[PDB]
Design a binder for this molecule. Structure first.
Ligand code: ATP
Ligand code: MG
Length: 249
C-alpha cells in the first residue's frame, strides 16, 4: 500500500478538533504532507513531543484529522518504543498462532535471535515472562514479532532501545533494509544514518513539518541544518541537539 498525507491537521481533544473541521487549543500535528510508495521507507525524526508517535496513531485511526486527507488502505503492524513480552514461548511471542517456517527463520536471523534461542535446552520452546530477558533481547523479540506479522504497513516507533551502537546498525541493515525491502514501512528515529538510507524523510518540530523529502534534498535545501560522531551520541543527547537546531531554524 501507498501512504499519503495532504494538509493534515489533528487535535487530540475531540472538541477542539470538531471546531477546526467546522471552521475550515494547540494541534498535535499541523499541515502534514508526505507520500510513500509501496515498498518504500519513510524515516520520521524530531524533537520530543513533536508528534512522531501521534502521526503513527493517526495512521492507525487512533487520531482523526480535522482538515486534510490521509490515504491508506491495508493491515498495520505496529512496533512500539516500549517492548512487551507475552508469558509464553519465544516462538509464540514472535508468530502468535500463524506458523510459516521460512518466514520465521528469516525473521529470527535478521533480528539476531538465533544465538539467543540456542542458549536454552527447549530452544524456541523456552517459556518467557519464567525466563527473564535483557532490554536488548526484549527489544529484538518485539521487533521480530512486528516484522513477522503479515501486514501491509509496518510502523516502527524507535524499536532499537537498549541495543548497543553496533547491534542497532546490523539489525537496521538486516531487518529494516534487507528483509523488509519490499514492505511499506515508517521508522521513527534520531539516527542520521537511517535518514540517509531512507527513501523519504520527515522532520517534525512542535507539530510542524520542518522538512519532507530525501536526504539529498536535505543536503540541497538545508546545508546549515546538516552541518559522523552524531549517531555515537546517546538517545537523550541526539534528541537535545536535534531539538535546539530545530528551534534556531
Ligand atoms: N492519546 C493521547 N491523548 C491526548 N494527548 C496525547 C496522546 N498521545 C500523545 N499526546 C500528547 O501529544 C503530544 C505529542 O506526543 P507524541 O507522543 O506524539 O510525541 P513524540 O514526538 O512521539 O514524543 P517522544 O519524542 O517523547 O516520543 C504530547 O503533548 C502528548 O502528551
Ligand atoms: Mg514517541
Amino acid at each position: 500500500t501507498e501512504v499519503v498525507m495532504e494538509n493534515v491537521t489533528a487535535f487530540w481533544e475531540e472538541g477542539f478538533g470538531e471546531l477546526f473541521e467546522k471552521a475550515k487549543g494547540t494541534p498535535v500535528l499541523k499541515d502534514i504532507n508526505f507520500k510513500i510508495e509501496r515498498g518504500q521507507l519513510l524515516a520520521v525524526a524530531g524533537s520530543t513531543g513533536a508528534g512522531k508517535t501521534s502521526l503513527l496513531m493517526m495512521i492507525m485511526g487512533e487520531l482523526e484529522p480535522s482538515e486534510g486527507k490521509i490515504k491508506h488502505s491495508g493491515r498495520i503492524s505496529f512496533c512500539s518504543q516500549n517492548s512487551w513480552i507475552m508469558p509464553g514461548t519465544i516462538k509464540e511471542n514472535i508468530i502468535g498462532v500463524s506458523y510459516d517456517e521460512y518466514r520465521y527463520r528469516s525473521v529470527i536471523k535478521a533480528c539476531q535471535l538465533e544465538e539467543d534461542i540456542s542458549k536454552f535446552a527447549e530452544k524456541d520452546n523456552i517459556v518467557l515472562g519464567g525466563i527473564t530477558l535483557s532490554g536488548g533481547q526484549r527489544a529484538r523479540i518485539s521487533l521480530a514479532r512486528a516484522v513477522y506479522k503479515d501486514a501491509d504497513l509496518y510502523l516502527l516507533d524507535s524499536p532499537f532501545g537498549y541495543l548497543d551502537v553496533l547491534t542497532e546498525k546490523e539489525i537496521f541493515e538486516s531487518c529494516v533494509c534487507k528483509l523488509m525491502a519490499n514492505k511499506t514501512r515508517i521508522l521513527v528515529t534520531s539516527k542520521m544514518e537511517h535518514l540517509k538510507k531512507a527513501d523519504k524523510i520527515l522532520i517534525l518540530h512542535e507539530g510542524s513539518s520542518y522538512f519532507y523529502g530525501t536526504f539529498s534534498e536535505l543536503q540541497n535545501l538545508r546545508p546549515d541544518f546538516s552541518s559522523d560522531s552524531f549517531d555515537q551520541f546517546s538517545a537523550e543527547r541526539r534528541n537535545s541537539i536535534l531539538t535546539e537546531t530545530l528551534h534556531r531554524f
